[PDB]
Design an enzyme around this catalytic site. Structure first.
Site, mmCIF file in Angstrom:
data_model
loop_
_atom_site.group_PDB
_atom_site.id
_atom_site.type_symbol
_atom_site.label_atom_id
_atom_site.label_comp_id
_atom_site.label_asym_id
_atom_site.label_seq_id
_atom_site.Cartn_x
_atom_site.Cartn_y
_atom_site.Cartn_z
ATOM 1 N N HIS A 24 0.792 -1.235 0.000
ATOM 2 C CA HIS A 24 0.000 0.000 0.000
ATOM 3 C C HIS A 24 0.826 1.287 0.000
ATOM 4 O O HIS A 24 0.524 2.221 -0.746
ATOM 5 C CB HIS A 24 -0.957 0.022 1.195
ATOM 6 C CG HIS A 24 -1.938 -1.108 1.210
ATOM 7 N ND1 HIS A 24 -1.619 -2.364 1.680
ATOM 8 C CD2 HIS A 24 -3.235 -1.169 0.826
ATOM 9 C CE1 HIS A 24 -2.676 -3.150 1.581
ATOM 10 N NE2 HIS A 24 -3.669 -2.450 1.063
ATOM 11 N N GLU A 56 3.329 -2.569 7.346
ATOM 12 C CA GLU A 56 4.159 -2.310 6.172
ATOM 13 C C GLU A 56 5.379 -1.442 6.482
ATOM 14 O O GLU A 56 6.374 -1.497 5.760
ATOM 15 C CB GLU A 56 3.325 -1.740 5.020
ATOM 16 C CG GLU A 56 2.374 -2.775 4.419
ATOM 17 C CD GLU A 56 1.699 -2.324 3.136
ATOM 18 O OE1 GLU A 56 2.012 -1.227 2.625
ATOM 19 O OE2 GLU A 56 0.846 -3.082 2.633
ATOM 20 N N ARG A 67 -22.942 9.005 20.631
ATOM 21 C CA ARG A 67 -23.531 10.220 20.073
ATOM 22 C C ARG A 67 -24.953 9.935 19.598
ATOM 23 O O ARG A 67 -25.207 8.917 18.948
ATOM 24 C CB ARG A 67 -22.682 10.767 18.918
ATOM 25 C CG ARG A 67 -21.280 11.211 19.322
ATOM 26 C CD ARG A 67 -20.546 11.860 18.156
ATOM 27 N NE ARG A 67 -19.108 11.960 18.404
ATOM 28 C CZ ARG A 67 -18.501 13.018 18.936
ATOM 29 N NH1 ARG A 67 -19.197 14.094 19.282
ATOM 30 N NH2 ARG A 67 -17.189 13.000 19.122
ATOM 31 N N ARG A 127 -16.410 17.257 25.720
ATOM 32 C CA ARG A 127 -17.827 16.947 25.517
ATOM 33 C C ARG A 127 -18.713 17.197 26.739
ATOM 34 O O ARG A 127 -19.929 17.354 26.601
ATOM 35 C CB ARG A 127 -17.994 15.506 25.031
ATOM 36 C CG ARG A 127 -17.727 15.324 23.543
ATOM 37 C CD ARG A 127 -17.902 13.878 23.113
ATOM 38 N NE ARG A 127 -19.276 13.406 23.283
ATOM 39 C CZ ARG A 127 -19.694 12.183 22.971
ATOM 40 N NH1 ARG A 127 -18.848 11.293 22.465
ATOM 41 N NH2 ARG A 127 -20.962 11.847 23.163
#
Lengths: 241, 240, 243, 239, 239, 239
Positions: A5, A77, A165, A220
């Site tokens: 990738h 990787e 949420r 929050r």
């Protein structure tokens, strides 16, 4: 390419064994500039790579994307190319009232609310950061003079229902996550995040060293100062070489 | 008159102590407390022998847990309601990494939860991790003594035999999920087996309590008083 | 000298004994042992205190286990290595049913597995069931001593507090799967809480070992209100018929 | 500037689009959108690149998801806040069945849930099933182009390596439950490995949204442009 | 003499490869006596089997009984004798308010609230129907012109606590099923049922084809002619 | 009429509180005739019920069918009618070498390899028989002079893969059932069976008394008079 990738070969790293792993590809170039000889390596999908130098030693800056799946590709990787130490940096939202915006969070271990961590070690296995990586991040937090919190982070495979949420399309949260935020608050969990569990379990179960630092931008519970987190991760990298 | 159910102790007996050193063996409680100042025996009920000593003029309690997380959970909880906030764990262990020797000291960052009692405090996904400051003072104390120190993950089992994959038993049998498990933990970088850390670290990390774990290696399973004792006391000075 | 790692016992210490009476407290071993012939102290290591005695001419071993499954599993395993095939659990317990009174006797048929040690011997689907002959002998023995006896299921928890749904703790809270758990246990006809039976009954029932359990009720958290010693006389009497 | 947190999109940007074609790679969206009328770039943030095109007079949004369930769950949810109700998945895949060749087409009826994010919407008991109308459209679109089509179940993993039983890794180690797992999926009729469908199909089927997947085979580990035409053709019948 | 429970042989089928499977043994007769030359085969316990002919081809009608255990035996022993396609016919009670008595429900996939399905594939594997089987049942429903609902069915191992019924001897439901009906209807589940999860997991993990159609007899949320003709019409197009 | 499935009023029992529960509907009549004044009550699906008299007391014999799901219905619905005691008579095959054909097995507890038992109590709850029922079945076995074995039984939701049978269409057994028989064998488990886990769990958790006795007709590792005599004899002592 020597990997699938990332579009990278072992020669690109030039003996680099430490990598700094932010989430956003746009922040990869930004972090690299703080170090000597910043050069772009490759850019494929959510994986942007840059090389730099600290005390003559080469280092990697590479993005992970969102979530454990893409992060599991990046860590694996990079590990194929010779990377043994991984330093995670991000920005998070605290769930504790005493943690303010601009404050810094150093993660010792993660609540495994993900799926990718299970692919490397069973649930009973701790998603724990490398102690020498955690030590370097804490010492680096004192030097920059940051308001630092050290503890546990809940790592979720979703931004919405997993972080409990309700301002969503369905407005529905699955049973086991309903009322879970308050439980994590009662257990002393600092924040929600989406990558740590995978990252930490990956490294702790395969002989790699991992650590996480993040800067608080929102809270929050209670309804742009200075980016201390970026300076901390590079300072820690210097001592880990 | 005791204010706790099992320990046979009250708030006043601690002298405002907020730190506890927790060995497994009741016999070993006396020996740790006497390395410190003003060692006073407090209570001895079952596997819970408690002594009180002093570090730099500060009250410190030493209390045994016994074997396993059930009796450890009783001790830690009842010490927590007596005012204790910091728990330093001292014990003996059998390492599973071939490069670890007898006489080496192990500092546990986090535990593999192969127990039941830890689930009574937090779901399995919650990390059985040690407090950073407890671990740091524990690592720094190991450097002063000069002991060969290994730092990492411990596998905390509810049994001595099948959960640690011992075969020389009455049945000579191990349940399928524990078959080849020792090898699996070896590859994951797990250094040792013990029986109390998963319960200790989980119940402390989920209840706002500081916890540290240290152990001295006495046996190695790849090839089937001490430092750790001195290390836990030195570390307790730097915590409070 | 020792053939086992924890108990401090040789196979010679038992003198051919195949039955063990297993209390929790080390301080109860001597007392139970002196109810039989030729009682002698064998070994005392940590939570494991052992005594040999004779019952109808045959050697019997009394050995404490300590608190919890982990310690229990060590004593039972090492005794099984030393020849013990039959295990009789003796202890004292609370109750969670209003009709069970202080002074009554409980014979456990099976345990609710709220421990972790039982998983080390058998999967969760496997029953933590007592041996029928052991259970029958304890039930007969209770009748012979004239005790008020209840026969049923015991919840065997790895903790004293949250697993038994206690709220007077440092945190003052219980995990969501233990919230209202006492209510549903007593709804299912569970007699009591205890901390060892799931391990004992599972590890024996999955290894060809016989196990039974009897306990004296000393308190009831549902009741208020205001000698027996049946439990001790029951475990001894039952042992004679299992020898 | 935007109605949603991640995509950088407002509801008005979609121009009433209720259907979304969702590729993985943000490089592949521009190409898909240009196969339709009036293609316009809307936003590019992180792995989320969104384009608006027109099909048979009706507006359609094409939007990338990135790699994995977590990022896919963000895109699908935020698109649903913008009014998207139908989600068609396109991609390129490998194969674990020997009778499936390179150049063939796979249509997924349901997914094996080897992910974590699906559990955030519905418990493991709940099936990760595709919508019937979406699947029917995809099969009918596969005939009209004359494609070698295989219809069935797909394994959806949260990793590229150990969850797909790959040993060509740094450690060379695969976890206990994935050791021998590929042979198990093969014997059960699973067509291929993939990394997003378990999340996509579960969250849609449990929240009243329609979802389907088509993929093109580019490799087969058992051995030594149809997909893009199908997804567009199927989007016509779903309006 | 070839199978343990059903008491049938390869020759009793006469080359038949399709089986229409109701739960009730008494309805087997009606389904068989709707096709050409119906012949009674065997009656062992809850396994009453008949043979009929459809478009000059042999077909089997065999009862499964109530639940996955008895259903798993019937399918397995039918499969040993050469049956490859299974079409579930039955009666069900809807949990959606928009589904009426007399409506037809076609099941694409099942929520696995059973134990028998795990004996063939782990929970992560989807209990999904074969597409061609679903296609034929959907077409047959339109061909008869019934009010059809296509989607997900909850497959419980119990009639009472698994379907959240409190009008019982105990009057109580186990805590994970407490409030579960509200959860399934919020996730879009059409109905409660007792056999599908086993049937659909069995076949999709063995290389067998399975579909399901059911007529609504009751609706608990609100205040056989169609389904039987649908399953027969659908069976015509599967061979 | 008073109940949904069984089709019995409370008065059809005439004050009956004990129920003998065989698996087979065709055995109910044969078992009932061993007692005084046997009379047919109702035959609906796999539920065949008769009323007999022991020592002047009214008893009921009712079939369960194969598996937990069908058994869960009968038990609860008989419990609605006033039945508080359930005694299961059955036929079985042992997995232990020392157990011979013709021997009698008394089940103390079951290994929960089923799904229906979870609907009444969580997995950690023991599927344990009532002691008074078990004692009565042991004493009655001594009086008949039967070679009796007392111990644990494995209660599977399937006949084939859950009992590790490879002689099947697939020739495959799921991962966790692979090598399971040997594991149960070494744990002293006597036999495979299909209803005990559901029966014993739902009774021990709801105030109902349950016991089980079975006759060995086959042994995998290698007359019918008893067991049926034992269950009737034990029933008398439980009245």
């Amino acid at each position: 390419s020597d990997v699938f990738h990332l579009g990278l070969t072992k020669n690109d790293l030039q003996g680099a064994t430490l990598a700094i792993v932010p989430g956003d590809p746009q922040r990869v170039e930004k972090i690299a500039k703080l170090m000597d000889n910043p050069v772009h390596l490759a850019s494929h999908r959510e994986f942007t790579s840059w090389r730099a130098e600290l005390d003559g030693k080469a280092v990697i800056v590479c993005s992970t994307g969102i979530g454990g799946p893409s992060t599991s590709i990046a860590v694996e990787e990079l590990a194929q190319l010779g990377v043994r130490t991984f330093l995670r940096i991000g920005t998070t939202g605290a769930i504790q009232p005493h943690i303010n915006v601009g404050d810094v969070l150093v993660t010792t271990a993660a609540v495994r609310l993900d799926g990718a961590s299970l692919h490397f070690a069973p649930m009973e296995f701790p998603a724990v950061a490398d102690f020498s990586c955690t030590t370097a991040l804490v010492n680096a937090a004192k030097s920059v003079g940051a308001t630092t919190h050290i503890g546990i982070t809940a790592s979720s495979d979703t931004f919405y229902p997993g972080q409990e949420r309700y301002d969503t399309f369905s407005g529905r949260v699955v049973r086991h996550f309903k009322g879970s935020m308050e439980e994590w608050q009662s257990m002393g969990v600092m924040n929600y995040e989406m990558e740590s569990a995978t990252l930490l379990t990956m490294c702790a179960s395969q002989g790699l060293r991992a650590g996480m630092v993040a800067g608080v931008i929102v809270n929050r519970t209670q309804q742009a100062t200075e980016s201390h987190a970026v300076k901390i991760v590079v300072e820690a990298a210097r001592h880990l070489l």
